[PDB]
Design a protein around this ligand. Structure first.
Ligand SMILES: CCCc1ccccc1
Ligand SMILES: [Cl-]
Length: 162
């Protein structure tokens, strides 16, 4: 497994504009278009992102290109953030994927506020980190996905995704 296979499981693939778990217009593999309630605003953001008039529909190739850009952006957000980078650099390769997954879902700023969990992860206190990560709006709103990510941090294996 790798980060692309992991996020494809967590996000799915839809080729027409849809609403995410929070009600926001989204397309592809979890690509957020806008938080505005206007479908026309979402369609405008989509055309700008793809470079053509899409009328709310994209191809699989276009979805996978947005996905590559979004994963790259998540990694760069980690590497430029003074709170996230040292923790990320301390992790093994499997747990790094769990970190990228959280930033992809919630953004660099949201994850950087998980101050106590970040310290526990840097100290390699896996069970303690797992308990702390579950005490969150994130876990309560998307519990099945959060459980998979937390299990990945707890064990350093892909068992939750197999
Ligand atoms: C609970 C924080 C997960 C994380 C995210 C980015 C980099 C390191 C750790
Ligand atoms: Cl879920």
């Amino acid at each position: 497994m790798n980060i692309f296979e992991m996020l494809r499981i967590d996000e799915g693939l839809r080729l027409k504009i849809y609403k995410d778990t929070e009600g926001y217009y989204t397309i592809g593999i979890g690509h957020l278009l806008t938080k505005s309630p206007s479908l026309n605003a979402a369609k405008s953001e989509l055309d700008k992102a793809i470079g053509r008039n899409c009328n709310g529909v994209i191809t699989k190739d276009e979805a996978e290109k947005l996905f590559n850009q979004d994963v790259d952006a998540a990694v760069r957000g980690i590497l430029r953030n003074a709170k996230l980078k040292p923790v990320y650099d301390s992790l093994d390769a499997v747990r790094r994927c769990a970190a990228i997954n959280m930033v992809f879902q919630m953004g660099e700023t949201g994850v950087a506020g998980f101050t106590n969990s970040l310290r526990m992860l840097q100290q390699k206190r896996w069970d303690e980190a797992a308990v702390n990560l579950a005490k969150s709006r994130w876990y309560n709103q998307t519990p099945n996905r959060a459980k998979r990510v937390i299990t990945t941090f707890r064990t350093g294996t892909w068992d939750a995704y197999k």
